[model samples]
Target: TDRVSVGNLRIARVLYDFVNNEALPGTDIDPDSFWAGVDKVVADLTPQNQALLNARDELQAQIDKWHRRRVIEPIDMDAYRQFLTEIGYLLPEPDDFTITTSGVDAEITTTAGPQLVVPVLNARFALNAANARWGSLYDALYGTDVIPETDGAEKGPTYNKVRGDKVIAYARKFLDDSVPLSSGSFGDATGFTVQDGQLVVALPDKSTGLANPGQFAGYTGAAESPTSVLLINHGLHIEILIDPESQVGTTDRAGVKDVILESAITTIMDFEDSVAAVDAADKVLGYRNWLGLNKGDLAAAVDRVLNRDRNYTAPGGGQFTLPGRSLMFVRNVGHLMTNDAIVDTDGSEVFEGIMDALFTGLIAIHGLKASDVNGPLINSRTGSIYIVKPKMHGPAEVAFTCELFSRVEDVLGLPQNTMKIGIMDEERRTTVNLKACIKAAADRVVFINTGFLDRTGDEIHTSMEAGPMVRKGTMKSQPWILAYEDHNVDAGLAAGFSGRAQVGKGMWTMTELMADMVETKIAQPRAGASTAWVPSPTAATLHALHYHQVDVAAVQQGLAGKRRATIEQLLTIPLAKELAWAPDEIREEVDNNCQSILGYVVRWVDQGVGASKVPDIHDVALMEDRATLRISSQLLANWLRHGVITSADVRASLERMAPLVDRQNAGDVAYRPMAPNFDDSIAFLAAQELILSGAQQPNGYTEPILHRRRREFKARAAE
Candidate 1:
């Protein structure tokens, strides 16, 4: 047999070796009991998991029939509410109570800043994200569009002195705003020194101290001329590194070389929608990477290690340190897919979510050990493993996830509630009944957030039989999206998540538009969200400005006790109120959706790249992932289903866009062209499969077809 015997389950040999050699050595978890417990838990939990899947379909059919029955008048609000209540799609609200989750680390509980989400399959990206706890503000500004390129000042082969000058101006201005002098600006400073335990900024002729001297948090080197001056504002730290001899420092009045902003306070190493793990090889690699990450030794071409605390001298006297790496959360996949990584005794592939909980949980114990003598860079100082579970339907699913974590705790001999769940409040069922969902996992829930892409896809699927939806561009302007965002904060505050856990927001997908990101993204903090998703570590640094600009605690304070976002707003469907598109307009819209779908799907299916900055039809880069792909395909599916477009039109766009997508990837040597061979190209066929089978796919998720096509391509290569 190719598989190893692990209790009643068949474990792939690669996974078994990794677990035995890499994951199980120092954790004190016996391989025997761990496997037996996993087998028992899988046996006990698999049935309930299937039952939950069945219930999703049952409620979906019920809602569909109810909508069709009232299709004459396009339904009324009062009647629809009653119908939902009757079918149990809507649950009764929970009693007033606050969450009692404890042992949360300060990054999630105290800090309000950017949260990075990266696929753990790539060790380089994972390492970059972990080290993103602190990033160079000057580098973040100079490299991206944050420093505008105009006249002769543009990024080129050599360092543009003109561009470098603007970067210094921007970085100096950041200091003036965040840590202002008592009399003069940072722009006028000639030198920085500590005299009698206070900062002295020599502004050309006169010396001055901070307006709010309390902002001086710490310093490094001697009191006379500290090498690094640290300041704290609104619970975040900023470091000003000074050197008179450095290239940029020689030109500076204050001898300042660089500024490091505390960026990406926490990062989620995703095994969920951000990755493509279809088989044993994929799962084993991601697990190995995670195992190394927990042990502080994950490697790629070079051996990468996590950063330890940055030591500094306290302003008053003694020494202190700040975290040198982002606090991490490994996002496990949702409940809809199965993998051949393990086969059950009854011949079913194990539920991927169950496998994720067990595998990731086991690997996390190495860092959470009571005595991590080798490295100080542990993920959670409070001894908790944060696992974010996405795309769950209702409170039952949330409660089910809690039970799985409980069983995992028992399996690994961890303390009770060691595994924390970050709920993605994206699904319609979860969004409407969020308070009840929070109550279910109240003690284990460390996170909850709003994601528009998957939420929009689920919305269209939930109301597919209702009517055609508005254009994809107008989806966010609808009442449902607005209420969904507000209600997420409302539910968290009502449950007392202010300082206990995190209330998050979604990503800024336009990765290249850093100046634009600087302009916006402040609304997340203003909206009372403690954390929001960012695409890259650099984006996190730019995004950190928002947290520094706004006080999240004060915002949440004002938002508390005001449940302004009603259930009515949440229930209002974003159905089209007007359909005035001409034939040419309809063709253009469909083509855009088709191009977006193909651009993302090709890499997902053929090359196994789960999430990346895929260039759009207009050659602009957007952070494309499974969630974004779901929204695109589901929109086309809904349009085809509701007679807004024909199958012929959909096929034409798919075939016609193949050449465009092919030309877009012509520079990559490993690329497979879809033009002239669209029939054989797996990704081309896979793109069509998604639109064709979207209505039947569970929750409009893109994983099922994407995995199938990925395996198909892999199999052909094997042949």
Candidate 2:
């Protein structure tokens, strides 16, 4: 690897070339100006960033000491609140205010639908997520468990007519519920036609118009015999494709081949917990892919198995193509870790968050410049760069981030407020001070979301000395969890985020349980969240139905006048009052956490796969990321700290579960077994450290250890 000297800093040549040759070329930015601006931002922000991180540690230490002293006595809520305020952990609430953010795209502002977070390190997954803006509702339902396998409806390798009928019935029912006819149900319709600009559904005896005529947007063929019909409801679009010659349409009375839902309205191209970019080389790959996406030339060759192009017939008889992409937002790393991509004058690595802020903004200049002249593949139609900043602790950190964005915009010669910030309210401090956090970035904030796993991890770490936490599965039922969820929405709505920005919910961890998801995940939109994260494109499509069922904007209107959760509620720590546990229960808890940590950590450390669907102790696959890892590790650590479990007990669980994980992943050729050589397996050792030292990890984060071990594994592989 070569190095490039850029005033007081040493940048890797690959990253240097990427910025100078690719990212800065089409834009007005010159190399000298770009590097100089970055140099100043890094120098000026480094000390402040370090100071803020030190504050995190200081506050944690204070809280830990307070909890330890009162270990035997019951916690006094008033005293706890006073202590936090004294330590500056809690700040005064701001006066009533609305965000002044402007130039945001509709996807982040007005539209209410599912959002996908894909690792930018993998181009294929990134492209698939990008093209997931439109998904097949029929395909999503038929392929998943949403359609039960009972009654001869099993999904065989080949398309089963029994299953196909069930899927059609399900889609028709959805149409009836969302875009109903005036007199007849969609299932009773024999055909569809456009009469006097109204969608007319032909019944067994006569034709009936839509109950809501405005829901009919347009058609894609002859009005009398349209190839496809477009419908709108609750600010989302659905297209019903028709073709008598098509496989499933040939057997249908209405010639409906598929129902296409406007899914994954926006996607977060993640560069944080979902990616393992341990070094400059890895970081450059992600930057390059982002560059290609902005350039509208990011293409990956598809294998024969996944190479199906989507085509639709026009209303007037010509073929038309739908957009093969989702609106994209880039999620940068938080304020914690430093990357070796660049080193400062003092010979220390620059803060990764600072580097990402400058570089990702620079790359986004491609899209900004192109959109200026009606360029192709425009990410933000409103000429703004969406950057989701994750894991910031409180209002102060958010204020610092907004300041950094201003500097990056000045350095890159971009307009003011060109960079929009998405605040992930997944930390304890942020949850308690959410209103102030939003106020801090109110000018550029376009998103706020609640993440369950990371939030739970922070809950445990923040109250590590407050006795053992309740079981991981029971965290959702805790008062703090409910308060946290409601508080995020209340804050966003209070700040007037309803039609101006997105208030999102966390991911549904279970990926394979679409039946349960379709039935339950509707609560997100009903809870007034405009957007929520989904694991896959198919999941996005399935979840889109929920948005149509509940009008999120209306829900927000109803919730706007509601009172926000009290700080006392948000600060309530979920500690178990009783210590009694059956031997079987204790073992089960440890075993579950151990299996999850090991399964995720092995792939993360050895293969550099940061996010994937890892099988649990019950052999059910769930989407695992650093957030999930943090919770599992922190739970076991909390148990160990309070004498609910022993280090030996944790080690025993790990040893016993290693073989199960190995067997579960036996089909993968790249898998390296951890059982036979547990002592030598870096991943196994990394998992152990995550559990044993989790209580001491900064904010109970798993990044520091994971990055070090991943680097070590990469070096060994090079050897």
Candidate 3:
């Protein structure tokens, strides 16, 4: 390994300079102490980290052997669970406890709203997400097919009157529903005026106040003829912009140009599945962006289609005589995969998670240090850094993260518990040992979100030899899923997460299916998740409507006296005991898996797109990422292992579906076709490898193969 010196200690050159020069300067941390602290922490924790990973493999081996034994034998749920417990796959339940996580913003702990996860590498995307804290209701409506782009109503370079009318009608309807006038509908009202601190709507005949006059928070411009008004409904803020000179405003009775809704209250600056940072160089960029964000001086130049250049700014928090919106959280990489970015003494890549922990924590110190400044201009007012740590298995890993944070603080010269953690209860071991996992980081935990795709991937890998799993579509209906969902909320609530941390649910992967989301996704709040994931800013605005409908804090309060999930239920693996699949069902699953694999892998390898909306087998575009690949690959592997499907069938399906994926992505200029030459295409081969070697992959993670193949592609492209 190359020796790199930063102050008194020698580290891998990349990290040493990064920490000593980039991370520690303005934070008043001593370079010598920081390096020494890292050396001690990595040395002390490296062995424990290795042990935990080994433990995961050991448990997987036992479960796999058990499944292999049962492939020909009868299924026994009780006996299977007992064996799992005996092998330490299932840990003893911990005593009831509540999280002591302080400094969590109300958007996470109190309000139930949409949370966006954006890759931090793209500065424009990062700024867009940060600014997405508020979105234009009119623009969100007029732009997308959410309001049908038909009959000359298509979104164009220039605004269309028909589309504008539809947007106004839609917005007025929402206004009526949310903050109704005392007498008439908002659409029927002629004018809006503020009188005696109440919003008065002037109809054709007479004046009327709001149904809830108290909802009127404030207004911009003169009180008598305010240009815009601010209103609060169910703790979320909505802004009405009035402009007489505007295109749409000129035609409106009240001259209201746009209505902005408080959307995407908390954004997860993702450094994980949504990003393809395979090495130190890739990771350092992500870390730097995060650092820029925490420091509040991050700027990036953007060239528009019109040849105009502009700079994006993260919207600083301010009140417009109205309440503020959601806060932001950052998602860090999980404790898997080693990176060559920072090689150890033996020339091996350091554990990527450890590297992430140190760097992310160091970056967060900027925010921590800023908040320590006098007055109300604070980054994290509660003296907390919200870092969403994903894919940890069990209590030991969670405890190790806590220790990592502690050491990061020591190195950076921060106080105890300065960095708050968000545990993604998305892995099998973490789910089973969830309560204990929460306990491990209880004091510093601020968020807990469930991701079914990643969780299911882990589920399949944990029990790869257990048996064939149900079809990907059917997995949601299984008993284990319900128990898992209920247990996450139960565990979080039981561990006293109430009013302290976020109880979150997964993403609504379908961006085009808003009507379905409005109908169903409300269950997250009902199930006690204070926050959940939404794909786009429009989705965030729409999902915000749900928070107005359900007070999640009240829901959690209602669920306070419920019984916690038993160890047996959490330990019960979701293995399909019977393989009685119809011919259509079998073929359908294969098509789905192949389509999904090809859809995601192609973009990841060719375009360097870590996350995007890709068409499924049905040609419906859903937001796809490596997490989606993990589940599909693992499912295919599980089926192959159980003789439900053969390797040849999978390859055939991939070949058959590759053209469809190609056609689906034909519109993207950067897309490389996988069908015409599947052999030479690394992206195509990566998809194949995912299914072919999925069972052997640790936790069914698509990263190792994806990263290797991606690096290869980059190398070849360079040549």
lDDT of each: 0.89, 0.89, 0.78
Return the lDDT, model 2, position 164: 93
Report the C-alpha lDDT of model 2 over 1-719, residue by residue, as the tens digit: 37788888999888998887778777877889889998889888888999999999999999999987874477899999999999999988889999999998877789999999999998888888988888999999999999999999987779899899999999999999999888978887778887666778888988899888888777776787887898889988899988879999987778889999999989999999898999999999999988877876677876511222346544335565544568789999999999999986677888999999999998887765444332365566689999999999999999999999999999988898899999999999998888899999989999999978999999999999888889998899899999899999999999999999999999987999999999999999999999999999999999999999999989999998687688888888898877557889889999999999999999999898988889999988898578888999999999999889887899899999999999999889999999978989999999999998898899999999999999999999999
lDDT of 1 by residue, 127-163 (tens): 9999998999989998999888996679998888888
lDDT of 1 at 236: 89
Clashing pairs in 3: 97-495, 98-495, 98-496, 265-326
Candidate 1 to truth, TM: 0.98
Q: Listing every candidate in turn, what is its Cα RMSD in Å to the true structure after a full C-alpha superposition? A: 1.4, 2.4, 4.1
Give lDDT tens digits, candidate 3, residues 290-363.
Answer: 77666655667875110111111111223433223235577878888888766655666677787777788877
Q: Model 2, 165: alpha-carbon shift in Å? A: 0.6
> Model 1 segments beyond 4 Å from truth?
370-376
TM-scores for candidates 1 onward, in order? 0.98, 0.97, 0.92
